[PDB]
Amino acid sequence: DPVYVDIDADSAFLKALQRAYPMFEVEPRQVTPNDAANARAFSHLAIKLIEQEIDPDSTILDIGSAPARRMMSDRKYHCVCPMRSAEDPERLANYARKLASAAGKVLDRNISGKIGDLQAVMAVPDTETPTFCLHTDVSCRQRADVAIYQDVYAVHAPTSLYHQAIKGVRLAYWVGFDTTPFMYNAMAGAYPSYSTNWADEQVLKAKNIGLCSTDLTEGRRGKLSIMRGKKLEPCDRVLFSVGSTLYPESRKLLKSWHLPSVFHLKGKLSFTCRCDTVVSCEGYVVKRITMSPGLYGKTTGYAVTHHADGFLMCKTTDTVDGERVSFSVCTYVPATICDQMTGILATEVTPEDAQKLLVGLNQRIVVNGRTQRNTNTMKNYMIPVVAQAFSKWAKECRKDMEDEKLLGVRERTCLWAFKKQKTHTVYKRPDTQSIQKVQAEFDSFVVPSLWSSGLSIPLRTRIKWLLSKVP
Amino acid sequence: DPVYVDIDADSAFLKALQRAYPMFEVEPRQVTPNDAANARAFSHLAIKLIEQEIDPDSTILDIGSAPARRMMSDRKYHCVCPMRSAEDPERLANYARKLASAAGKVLDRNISGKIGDLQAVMAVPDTETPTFCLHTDVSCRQRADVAIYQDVYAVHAPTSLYHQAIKGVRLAYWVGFDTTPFMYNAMAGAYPSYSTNWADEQVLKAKNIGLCSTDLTEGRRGKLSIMRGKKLEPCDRVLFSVGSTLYPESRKLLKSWHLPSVFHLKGKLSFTCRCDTVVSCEGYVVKRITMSPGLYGKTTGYAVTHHADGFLMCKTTDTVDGERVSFSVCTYVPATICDQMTGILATEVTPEDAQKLLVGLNQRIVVNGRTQRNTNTMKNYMIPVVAQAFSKWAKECRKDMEDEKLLGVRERTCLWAFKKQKTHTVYKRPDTQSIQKVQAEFDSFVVPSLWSSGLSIPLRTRIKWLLSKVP
Amino acid sequence: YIFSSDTGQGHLQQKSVRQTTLPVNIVEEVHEEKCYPPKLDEIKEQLLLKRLQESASTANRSRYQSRKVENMKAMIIHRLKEGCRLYLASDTPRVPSYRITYPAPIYSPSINIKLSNPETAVAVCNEFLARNYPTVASYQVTDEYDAYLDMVDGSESCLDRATFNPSKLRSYPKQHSYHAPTIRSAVPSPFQNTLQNVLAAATKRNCNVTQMRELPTMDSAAFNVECFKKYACNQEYWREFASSPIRVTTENLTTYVTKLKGPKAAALFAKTHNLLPLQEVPMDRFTMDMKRDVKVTPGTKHTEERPKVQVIQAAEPLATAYLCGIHRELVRRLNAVLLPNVHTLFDMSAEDFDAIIATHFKPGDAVLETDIASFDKSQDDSLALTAMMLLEDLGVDQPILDLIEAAFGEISSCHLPTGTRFKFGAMMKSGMFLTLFVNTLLNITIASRVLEERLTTSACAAFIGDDNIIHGVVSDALMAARCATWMNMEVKIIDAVVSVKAPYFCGGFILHDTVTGTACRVADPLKRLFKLGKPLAAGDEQDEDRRRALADEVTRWQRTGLVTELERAVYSRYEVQGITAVITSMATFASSKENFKKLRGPVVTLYGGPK
Ligand SMILES: Nc1nc2c(ncn2[C@@H]2O[C@H](COP(=O)(O)OP(=O)(O)OP(=O)(O)O)[C@@H](O)[C@H]2O)c(=O)[nH]1
Ligand SMILES: Nc1nc2c(ncn2[C@@H]2O[C@H](COP(=O)(O)OP(=O)(O)OP(=O)(O)O)[C@@H](O)[C@H]2O)c(=O)[nH]1
């Protein structure tokens, strides 16, 4: 009944996990000094919740399909394993090695069936087997009822969902990061609770962000180039760093998973879909999607996000390769810090003063003449940027009160030509929702109707030669 | 028989919930980290109270309900379930699956009768059934005594009630949000206790309200528009947000449910009706309506609302898409805060001074922290707007004292002056009442007929296969 | 301090309120003192400053400071009133009170006797010291190199829960200039501000843990308040006082600030720019202060062991200004509930004390004097609960009690020059603005519980600080058994008999006159005598307030009918003979400015000058 996770016994992340999963018992047991321990604990608990609310005697399709993780289980899994990354050769060999060693000792699970199953695929690479295949998500022919996506950012959501629906799938799940910052068109951001930093490729030579590197220069009054600039805008290329591992991604595919509340898929067959969020913890979310045959209802095309803690996005000036440039960054703030600065932000404060209070609030707070220690701390490398954002917010609010307009009318002065104001900070307080407009009607699907096997002869020989030596 | 609710054991909503229901004893039991626990907890208790006080062995109509949550109730229910919305395929499929999941476990709740009834309706879609129906509220032909509406905002109340009374209904109930804010012609508002925010369509791009979004900009000089503006008035489309779910609504249907004390329904037959409020708790009300045949009495056309907490509305200035405008915002205030601010509002107070006092009061009510850490009786994101309202109210009360007038006469200058004054804040203190003028004579009822099946062939085939087996 | 200090400032007032013109005691009513509200005026200052430049002999300057200080007082009121908006209240109807008055005292004539040559006076004093105190008169053989000798030997300390930087522990002496004394009493010089001295002062170990706020602690506190209300108070005011709370009021702040002096007001004004609210001021943070003077008593003990170092724990400056307006009301309420035969030195003067005990003490009467200084109040947590229970019964408003309670728990102290951190548990002695009041309440409670009903049937009882005197009580085994519940050295008791063993009270002697036949209180001559042998720091110009204080004290000593009694009282206490000559020597010293210059000498400079 208890669930064990591989994090420190004195960590401050235990309380966050317990509140997110109140139906389990969580105890720590550390056996590895991993640099991404927090990011793996959330995923481990998510699968147990997912596989508990679905009845047995049902087939589950796995898209990421790391076969080693699903070896010791009672549910029926169909792993879809293409060969398109440098991770794949290592995982396939590991799967074969574990299967051979596990033969005989374990009898409850279908170890014998899996071993014979893998040999059949090795004979000819074009057989759809109950537990394994070498096709993509589109080209798979096996029919099931439940589909599971785990940390998948390399597919188009509307296209992938449609191909699963026509095979008779009525339920889907998605576990991954929050896509809200990418809908605001930011440049760099961070997830301080999971030691994750991401930045655009164009600003990889910055000086004062989470993911950058620069050199030492004495200065130069004059230097030329080979092309004109005058514009710096985000492009379709970003880089992710989860503790110590690098992952390149694209903006177009990330934004495709920010599905609205209700949408219609129209093709040869029509379906009606819904999307809900069931679990949220400081950046990780779990989404459940249901699909039904037919086409009736109406759509509005809006997406709603609920904020349990503060969310900031401001404008900062930084030196990129010796040149001063300005761009936007975003981050998260704990709810306790936000609540304790309500009265301070009633006036105008300098960035220096705001920094001093933030450092003090991070250690102690006085209540009714009594001093107590704060148990909700935040990383110290994000304080300078947060303090700057708060100062800008306070000044903007004061200028709005000093200029009051009439009720029910607007001053467009003739030929209109109204004036626009300047905004330098967006601040979303706890218990506040954000609404955005997206597309809710899809009718275009394209498929590369060709099958190519990336499997190689030397890899086939090693796998066959590895499985031959049965214990 | 204690009642179990799905809320946290240390929440402050338990005290308010117990006070509104003195006949029951309630303790919490949390199994799911839902974002709308308070909203669902109130609805669960409301149904229990209605069932306790209703006459047994009677037939009840349910309008637009989910037939899965009435499965284990000994009362006689007839569910009117059309397929207008997009959430119906999931609800109907769940009902069929749950019925077949337990066919021998329960042998007294008429499970076999419900299954057999579902068989006939899926055969021919126009037949009647003592437990199921696919018509609308103005098309069902079965007769009974009681009708129940639970969170229904998509019908016109005078028209729907008249059609129910023809079949012989003498008692009805209604559960939902309070209608008072929409009778004041508000522009935006919030329910802080249930984490609900609503806003108009035209101000979805605001900056400092509950439900809005925007983006960073530098601001330019002059913007040429296309047609004339100079008008900002509420429209007929309103967006609701409960937790992380979105619901579109219309003002005309919302205002039709704020019925007066006595009204007459005249047509082929005549009835006399009354409306009373039974339970009220921080925004939810339960309404009881009795209907009798005949036509005799007298009507005045007034509606009365009793305030247990503070109700506030004021004028605020914000920027929509970079342009400054002004509109109105409404909210609720706890009674304890209102009582303790009586001594400060005797003079003129600065908005920043009022904000600091409100933060001090809210932070001090906790008077603990060894056990209850830091708990607040007011959400902190509404303090800025509330503080400004009190400042304007105090200013307006001063001017009346230096402008005393004679008793029984009116000051004019034909050729009179008759000058009006500014009003920027409406504040209803606890233990006060609000009165409105509405309509009380209804004699125009129309039926559109043209009933459609509203069911598809794949959906019927899929459902029939689900319960095609006896086990 | 209490009656009078060395400069004649004291803690008591100088206005008589307990005097009547009739030979019998008369009960009267307690009234209130109206205070002039300060007002702001800037045009007067501008014109007076310009008129100051054109002509200013002596009084023209004084008008400027009076105008300037008056402006500061008004500004402080305006700023202070805005901070405590959540605690401010109005004036409610007051509860009347009554008090007893006594006839005026009678004194005997005084005759002045003095010598002529001031050098002979020094010789007589030196002869007196050598004959009675041989070891003390031979200590001084060289200069004052105490600082160097303290540096040569290392540092010994007994600390608990403290942190410090070892790299800053260095104690090389600085420049020291003083005047060589003439009296051969070896009174040490004040210590230097070093890290070594700070650690030596904090060598106290009071680490004791008991039940914080559990059932056994509450039971002991409940019994203590029952004894206090049953054996030392009447029952005619409790129910009325509970109905009317005590809250912060504008009149309290206006009256308080107006009573401050010039320099004190200026110091408070400098800390009003960044004014924190009342609820933001911490109540459990203190600062450490060292500047004190060593305390020496007659005898031979400072020539063998080094004396201790005194320390002050200072609270927040804003904390002692927001709530210091409720002290007057607390004093009035406490005096109303006490029995007529029980007295407290608060709100009295020297003359009022004499009139009260004028006809109560006669020769052959037993007097019990007891002090409670030698008691560890930090061991038991019930001593703090008892004070709070008494405060709640007196009618203190509830939110204010929480602020007071926060200062009686865990506190921390810091030394700014060195960054040294200290932590202490439950502590009673501190620098807050309720220290004498709580100590007086605990002193009365302890005496009431131990003595039971013997306190009610008494002629006169006086309680102040840590000292008390009770008339007609002797020492028996019943009080020893009652007090031996935990240990035996809780309190120190001494038996005294009038005209045989003179009682001691607040550094003075209680004697019965012979010509008139009335009791009176006088000061201690030996304590003064050792004090004149204290070196004077260079650059000090306070050699005129001391002469007036000595002149007043000398006159009281030479009253007829008290010379013989004073001789016997000193001998029975210190076993010393020949003090009449010393008093005569003191008389000629306090006769002129030049006669006071014979107690000093040439200036000596040490550790200074690169030559
Ligand atoms: N941006 C991004 N993050 C991923 C991806 N795959 C996994 N992660 C995250 O990396 C974390 C750790 O990766 P693992 O689940 O241990 O898989 P792995 O192949 O062993 O990777 P490493 O442990 O880092 O060597 C996971 O918890 C994910 O949150 C991906 O494809 N893109
Ligand atoms: N404004 C509005 N509120 C609704 C409506 N329907 C339900 N609500 C409220 O929203 C709250 C959230 O409930 P949900 O999270 O949707 O779960 P549920 O109560 O089981 O009902 P469904 O999931 O919608 O089938 C409900 O408790 C209702 O009080 C609606 O149609 N309009």
Ligand SMILES: Nc1ncnc2c1ncn2[C@@H]1O[C@H](COP(=O)(O)OP(=O)(O)OP(=O)(O)O)[C@@H](O)[C@H]1O
């Ligand atoms: N169309 C697909 N259908 C199913 N699985 C896919 C598909 N495309 C990629 N994968 C799987 O995704 C996993 C890794 O994704 P990817 O091929 O993008 O590696 P990458 O080059 O490192 O880029 P990324 O940072 O997005 O992971 C592989 O296991 C791969 O089999």
Ligand SMILES: Nc1ncnc2c1ncn2[C@@H]1O[C@H](COP(=O)(O)OP(=O)(O)OP(=O)(O)O)[C@@H](O)[C@H]1O
């Ligand atoms: N005339 C009706 N009689 C009975 N039920 C109805 C009627 N009209 C709608 N409903 C029910 O209302 C529920 C949802 O409301 P609606 O049909 O208006 O679609 P929606 O837009 O998703 O909801 P809403 O308008 O409240 O935001 C459906 O379950 C539907 O059965």
Ligand SMILES: [Zn+2]
């Ligand atoms: Zn496959």
Ligand SMILES: [Zn+2]
């Ligand atoms: Zn029907």
